[PDB]
Amino acid sequence: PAQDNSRFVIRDRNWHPKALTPDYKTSIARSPRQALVSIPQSISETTGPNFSHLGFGAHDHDLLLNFNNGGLPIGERIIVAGRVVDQYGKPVPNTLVEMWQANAGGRYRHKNDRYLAPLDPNFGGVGRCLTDSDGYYSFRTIKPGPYPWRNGPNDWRPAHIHFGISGPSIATKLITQLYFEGDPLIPMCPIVKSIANPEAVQQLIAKLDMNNANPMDCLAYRFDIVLRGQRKTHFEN
Amino acid sequence: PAQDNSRFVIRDRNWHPKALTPDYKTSIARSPRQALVSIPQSISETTGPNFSHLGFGAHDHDLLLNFNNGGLPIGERIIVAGRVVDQYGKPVPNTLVEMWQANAGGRYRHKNDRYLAPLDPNFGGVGRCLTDSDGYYSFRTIKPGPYPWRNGPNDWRPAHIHFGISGPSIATKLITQLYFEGDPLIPMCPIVKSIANPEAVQQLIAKLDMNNANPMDCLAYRFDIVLRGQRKTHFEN
Amino acid sequence: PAQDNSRFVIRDRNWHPKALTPDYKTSIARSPRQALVSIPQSISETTGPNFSHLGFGAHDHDLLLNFNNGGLPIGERIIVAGRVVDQYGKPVPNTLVEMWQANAGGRYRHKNDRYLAPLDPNFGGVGRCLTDSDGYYSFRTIKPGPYPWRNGPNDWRPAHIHFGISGPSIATKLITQLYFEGDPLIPMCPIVKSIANPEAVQQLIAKLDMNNANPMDCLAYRFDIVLRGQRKTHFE
Amino acid sequence: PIELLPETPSQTAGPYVHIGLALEAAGNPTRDQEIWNRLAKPDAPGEHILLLGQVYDGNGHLVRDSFLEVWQADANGEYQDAYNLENAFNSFGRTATTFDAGEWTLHTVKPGVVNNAAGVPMAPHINISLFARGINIHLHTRLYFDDEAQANAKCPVLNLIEQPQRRETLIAKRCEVDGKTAYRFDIRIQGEGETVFFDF
Amino acid sequence: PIELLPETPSQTAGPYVHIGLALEAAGNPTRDQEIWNRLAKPDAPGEHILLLGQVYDGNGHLVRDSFLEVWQADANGEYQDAYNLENAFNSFGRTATTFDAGEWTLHTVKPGVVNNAAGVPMAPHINISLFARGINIHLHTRLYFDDEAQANAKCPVLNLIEQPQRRETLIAKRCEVDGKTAYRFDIRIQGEGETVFFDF
Amino acid sequence: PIELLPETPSQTAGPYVHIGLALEAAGNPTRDQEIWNRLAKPDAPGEHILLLGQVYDGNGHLVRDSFLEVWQADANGEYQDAYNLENAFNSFGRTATTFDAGEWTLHTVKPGVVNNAAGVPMAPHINISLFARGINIHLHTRLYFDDEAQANAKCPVLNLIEQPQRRETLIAKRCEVDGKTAYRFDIRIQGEGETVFFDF
Amino acid sequence: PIELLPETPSQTAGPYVHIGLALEAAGNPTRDQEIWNRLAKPDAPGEHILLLGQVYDGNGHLVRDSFLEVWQADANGEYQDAYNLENAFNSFGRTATTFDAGEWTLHTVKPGVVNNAAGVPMAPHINISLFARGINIHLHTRLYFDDEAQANAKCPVLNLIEQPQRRETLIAKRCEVDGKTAYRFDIRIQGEGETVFFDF
Numbered sequence A, B: 001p002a003q004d005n006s007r008f009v010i011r012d013r014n015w016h017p018k019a020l021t022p023d024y025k026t027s028i029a030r031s032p033r034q035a036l037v038s039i040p041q042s043i044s045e046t047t048g049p050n051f052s053h054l055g056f057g058a059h060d061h062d063l064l065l066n067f068n069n070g071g072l073p074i075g076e077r078i079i080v081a082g083r084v085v086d087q088y089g090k091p092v093p094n095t096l097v098e099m100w101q102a103n104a105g106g107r108y109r110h111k112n113d114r115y116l117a118p119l120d121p122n123f124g125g126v127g128r129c130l131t132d133s134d135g136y137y138s139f140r141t142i143k144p145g146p147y148p149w150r151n152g153p154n155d156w157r158p159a160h161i162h163f164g165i166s167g168p169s170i171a172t173k174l175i176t177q178l179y180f181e182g183d184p185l186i187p188m189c190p191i192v193k194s195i196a197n198p199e200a201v202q203q204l205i206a207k208l209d210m211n212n213a214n215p216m217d218c219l220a221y222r223f224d225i226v227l228r229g230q231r232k233t234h235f236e237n
Numbered sequence C: 001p002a003q004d005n006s007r008f009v010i011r012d013r014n015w016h017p018k019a020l021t022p023d024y025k026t027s028i029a030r031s032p033r034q035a036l037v038s039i040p041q042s043i044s045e046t047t048g049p050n051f052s053h054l055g056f057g058a059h060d061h062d063l064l065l066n067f068n069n070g071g072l073p074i075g076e077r078i079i080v081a082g083r084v085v086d087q088y089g090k091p092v093p094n095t096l097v098e099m100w101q102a103n104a105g106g107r108y109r110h111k112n113d114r115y116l117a118p119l120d121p122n123f124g125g126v127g128r129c130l131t132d133s134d135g136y137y138s139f140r141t142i143k144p145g146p147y148p149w150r151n152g153p154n155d156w157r158p159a160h161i162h163f164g165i166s167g168p169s170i171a172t173k174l175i176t177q178l179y180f181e182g183d184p185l186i187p188m189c190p191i192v193k194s195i196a197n198p199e200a201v202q203q204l205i206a207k208l209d210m211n212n213a214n215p216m217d218c219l220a221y222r223f224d225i226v227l228r229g230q231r232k233t234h235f236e
Numbered sequence D, E, F, G: 001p002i003e004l005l006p007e008t009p010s011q012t013a014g015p016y017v018h019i020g021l022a023l024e025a026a027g028n029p030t031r032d033q034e035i036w037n038r039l040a041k042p043d044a045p046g047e048h049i050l051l052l053g054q055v056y057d058g059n060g061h062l063v064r065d066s067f068l069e070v071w072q073a074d075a076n077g078e079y080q081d082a083y084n085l086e087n088a089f090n091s092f093g094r095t096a097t098t099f100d101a102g103e104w105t106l107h108t109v110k111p112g113v114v115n116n117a118a119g120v121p122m123a124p125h126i127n128i129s130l131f132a133r134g135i136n137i138h139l140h141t142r143l144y145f146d147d148e149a150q151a152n153a154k155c156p157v158l159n160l161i162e163q164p165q166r167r168e169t170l171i172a173k174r175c176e177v178d179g180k181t182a183y184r185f186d187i188r189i190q191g192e193g194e195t196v197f198f199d200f
């Protein structure tokens, strides 16, 4: 079973988005109005699931093939790859990375999406994988389209892929979004701008990565993820 | 019949791309090695077709509907609109604008395209229209994907739409390409870089145009086109 | 049993010198006029010779001792050392590094060199070695002199050592030249200037490395070499 | 001062979180193996219990698109981190509110007592992280049990909440669902009865 | 000096130009009305002729993906600019090389003489603009006729080409195709016999 | 975008390349072990062949200071990367043009077929890299055999050369040189009959 | 991206708004023609109705210096934009809360049904813009009628309000005021029962 053997650097909650960001309208009623209560790390917080023994399918990381209904998805073929490290720069091996996205036209395969852009019969929009022993993950997919949403009267999300990363403890678990280099919608989005510091937003922008492209086949983007630094306990009790 | 009633400002052939641009490999053998011979404008050059009486179909300008085989195309729904003016700033009314492009995944509907990204059964990729009395044109389409090509070993065209514009004479006719704001492939492309002056390349970059978007429906891009200035003859003979 | 198990990052042929660079006169007739034909990598391109079991003599890397005809060569005693890595920063171990150069006066020991600066009876001008397990190589030599050549009417090569590096495949093999920090001939040379980007030229300039010098003995220069990035195939 | 690499910033999980993390609930096919809401096989050691609850916004309206991750000790007070669908017990699970009723469910065992870092026993608890459209960074809380009053009164984590009235927000109410032992843990994100949320 | 707005810069028409401007040739369906290579209805005034040609690159190889636009006077020396598929004659047309043989064809009438801006008669000619993959800005040329030698020798445009040998590159060769009067106009983009290209 | 460390830029091998890589040709003593032009000892399996050729510049003149490196499969279509002078066969060798006649020679065996990365058989070939004074970055080409016509026609690399006329530049001509089977492979760097050079 | 000229920014109408837009309420003389609160003369077709209401701030206190502008279809569902005091009906009017009681009144007819831009019928409504001291940019709302329940349930604008509880805030209550049919429509700017305000 799991042991308390480490501590995780405290989050900077001015680097992360704050809860109440009223231009993102749904945040108004879904944000606390009392302060978070700080508590010391115990075994409850410094441990978490490891997914090394989860059964992954052959195509779980390949969105071109994992929803195959007679053909390939339509859209910009891309590899999305990167490294998961902690704040000390140490790789985070054997960690679960999950992703979900809309299709090339900005339509999600979800019963609550009322955008009338069509579904792609060969695209599902979900992937997962486990980082390798050096911290690296890779997915193959199509680039998602922007899509409109009922925030302001003409608001559009930039093209994005949602990511979830487990890390070594429940204290490190993170959900975030990847955006794409140069997208002119990024500075306009109230969800992006829930992050107050523009330097923090830059950390969510995936860079075109020609070195990882497959010629005559697919482009590639690089998205590195940084989880809370993990250190040994010292001088405690 | 047509009359010689005007002159067209001489082209700047250092603003346009030169013929021999060897990083674009096919230009090497398809560029002259003798100088162009300059000739004065005559009625042969200062006249050209007007397409006001060409029969346009209802959907000729709407690539979402003009190749309808049971559904909508997959991809980023966009309006591409702008104004055609001459170098003096005067609108060019009732002029033919034609466009052609790949689908959302960078596949062209042409028998010579060997890229294996799939065709979209509801997308053709051709449009045309005639500018209105104030010089404005509009198309509706999906944003094309980048695509790989056999130039260097890992070359990719940025997302682009090919354009042809007639203007008032054969002296004004132009073929060009529209690129999209922020695309990181633009500075890397040897066809883009056939244009030596980076300020000239900027003229080919369409800007996101939120004011022309249809909320919950489609985004919009603006691409204005400048043809050779037209002036009356003076002090001739 | 060489296996195709990797890909090499495509070369930037605007970083390298172009073929046609007319101020370097011999390039005019020895440059193609048709475009190169791009081809995908196969086992033919992604493999190459490994020289681990080439039989190196004891002094193959030491030009002060490898042409010994009664004494030491005349000239500036130097160590030339560095690391061979790929574009991802990974060391390139057990790779062949070959070098050749003129003597202290700019004279090559080659029958076709008609420059009238004398040969040095104790200097040959050739070295080789294999990088170690961490990618490091080292030679000991004398600093070559500049030398004049029949390009323009008063052209002089900067002091230089020619280098050949094999790397993991025929796709990575490179011939290049090392120049020396501060040499005022560098910006004037039409061979140096076959490289259009001055930042690329800077990559060929060896830096004085006092930390690697042997006091009362020899100076040292550092020359790191970067070969094409090597990655595993994916999604093929 | 010393500055480490910055953490990648959080973003909302968004309304369509289910397509990545609750596939069935999105209306979609599932993969061979999914991480979900049954932590205990029928023969797992300990007292088998159902947990359920609803999530409310600041206007008292159900949050029908919320997603919860849970982490708890097993009945013997051990955290089982080697996640495996073949395990008798997993300490980790996921659940989501139904869109109709807005109710999430979890099938598990009552957790055993674990000590804090100073060796002081904590009352039995489930660690919860709450994600949803509108929640920019997930909210951490704990579910304790109303039939553990003696332990709860001495818990070194509950005792860090200054006001007893606020401690009450973390106590799940014992009840019965289809005749089986259950505890209800409603979360109020904002306003009257606002649930305590933690930082650590 | 006075600087006007810069012209939008040219780019290559590219290998797939046909999908926009020669739909049939791309392998695609055509629209009700297309701008193409039959300038004259059978009863149009003048001498009906076929024009045809091949386009060569600097290595002497066929350019199989070239696209040509033409502009010529009618038989009476009038430019008919009101383009209409119902016209007896259009002064404008388009054609493309076949991919197999690399040959383009145009069905038209021999153009009448038109004066230049100084009132000097020009020899009968077709104005041609050549587009293709690899051609960054279109190339302008003129097709004159080998059976108009007297007029050609006096043409104020041909006379601006310094070398008579180069003037010969613009003279189409009379021939017969399926027994019908025709003229062949091959274009050599580069090298030996390079076709004269104009700027204006 | 992502930018890696830049590659060290190439420079010409220069006129005295042989002092470093071809010691005998410089007029100098050789070391105990040298890398040179006999890939196969007499006992190696396969068809033993002589390869020879000359190298021409753009004015049709011999390049007398050329240096070639070659890489080929053995007779069974396997590349042998463990270079050792003891081996019956090495996949790698070097040669150079002699200063008087301009001819290089290689002693080897005809390579077997090897598949490309998609599993499609390539015609038998020798990979060549050409270095010389005036060549700023080495030129890559392939030598194929005129007695492998059926295979050459189907080679996925030869078929990437757009023009058949250019494919002909990579086909060596079978002959006999003092009784032994040989193939001649001339390289023309520039101009008429210019040899295809590759990038990869 | 493309940026147009920026809109002139709004400012509060302020406490003395009535001097400019509601001359009588300021205690001042009026001009010969004023824009005010009687949209219909007695002879206008339709059901004549009185509308009245009060405006509350976030502490539940009357806003006594509110100014409302209204825009509604006539009884036949047509908007009449030609404003003229001679007309039997105008689609536009103004009212204000009295300083002692805080009540505004409007005399009009019940509007007919008008379709949205997709051709879907909207329930009968009056468009309201609310201005006042402390309101930096005016608030847009709609007044619907409690005796149009079937239509209200199907209104494509009401259905864009996510919560039914919030839709109830836009429904005016039918009553009788000294014998005449009336509807009361209170607006709560902030807090419990907060009125839905729109952006468009």
Ligand SMILES: Oc1ccc(F)cc1O
Residues within 6 Å of the ligand: A020, A032, A033, A034, A035
């Ligand atoms: O009660 C609050 C009010 C404003 C805010 F930004 C945060 C809060 O917790």
Ligand SMILES: Oc1ccc(F)cc1O
Residues within 6 Å of the ligand: A038, A039, A040, D160
């Ligand atoms: O004793 C503690 C109490 C609260 C906290 F956040 C940290 C501690 O170490």
Ligand SMILES: Oc1ccc(F)cc1O
Residues within 6 Å of the ligand: A007, A008, A009, A010, A039, A040, A041, A042, A236
């Ligand atoms: O004891 C601790 C040490 C570091 C930290 F971030 C939290 C702790 O509770």
Ligand SMILES: Oc1ccc(F)cc1O
Residues within 6 Å of the ligand: A115, A116, A117, A118, B072, B077, B216, B217, B218
């Ligand atoms: O209104 C619409 C919006 C998006 C779409 F794909 C189709 C529509 O009819």
Ligand SMILES: Oc1ccc(F)cc1O
Residues within 6 Å of the ligand: A186, A187, A188, A192, A193, A194, A195, A196, A197, A198, A201
């Ligand atoms: O908070 C922000 C973040 C990114 C940006 F472009 C603008 C912002 O105001």
Ligand SMILES: Oc1ccc(F)cc1O
Residues within 6 Å of the ligand: B020, B032, B033, B034, B035
């Ligand atoms: O013959 C030429 C050579 C080089 C060039 F850039 C243009 C030419 O016309």
Ligand SMILES: Oc1ccc(F)cc1O
Residues within 6 Å of the ligand: B038, B039, B040, E160
């Ligand atoms: O007479 C002329 C000749 C050539 C030219 F380009 C312009 C002229 O006006």
Ligand SMILES: Oc1ccc(F)cc1O
Residues within 6 Å of the ligand: B007, B008, B009, B010, B039, B040, B041, B042, B236
């Ligand atoms: O006469 C002319 C005047 C202006 C011009 F650009 C060309 C001409 O031939």
Ligand SMILES: Oc1ccc(F)cc1O
Residues within 6 Å of the ligand: A072, A077, A216, A217, A218, B115, B116, B117, B118
């Ligand atoms: O090799 C390929 C490249 C693009 C594609 F869409 C499919 C393929 O199999």
Ligand SMILES: Oc1ccc(F)cc1O
Residues within 6 Å of the ligand: B186, B187, B188, B192, B193, B194, B195, B196, B197, B198, B201
């Ligand atoms: O000619 C150019 C044009 C655009 C650019 F980004 C770079 C260039 O060198």
Ligand SMILES: Oc1ccc(F)cc1O
Residues within 6 Å of the ligand: B022, B028, C020, C032, C033, C034, C035
């Ligand atoms: O044929 C060429 C002409 C000029 C140049 F720079 C490169 C070429 O390949």
Ligand SMILES: Oc1ccc(F)cc1O
Residues within 6 Å of the ligand: A215, A216, B150, B152, B153, B154, C038, C039, C040, F160
């Ligand atoms: O199919 C290909 C063709 C040429 C090339 F350079 C790369 C490829 O992948």
Ligand SMILES: Oc1ccc(F)cc1O
Residues within 6 Å of the ligand: A213, A214, A215, B154, C007, C008, C009, C010, C039, C040, C041, C042, C236
């Ligand atoms: O398959 C490939 C992948 C990367 C590369 F650089 C070349 C290739 O042929």
Ligand SMILES: Oc1ccc(F)cc1O
Residues within 6 Å of the ligand: D152, D153, D154, D158, D164, D165, D167, D168, D169, D171
């Ligand atoms: O100490 C306490 C613990 C839980 C609770 F509900 C109330 C308390 O006062």
Ligand SMILES: Oc1ccc(F)cc1O
Residues within 6 Å of the ligand: E152, E153, E154, E158, E164, E165, E167, E168, E169, E171
């Ligand atoms: O004046 C001429 C006109 C056409 C031609 F072919 C040759 C000439 O000398």
Ligand SMILES: Oc1ccc(F)cc1O
Residues within 6 Å of the ligand: F152, F153, F154, F158, F164, F165, F167, F168, F169, F171
């Ligand atoms: O396909 C070919 C291969 C080799 C050659 F010489 C000619 C060809 O047409």
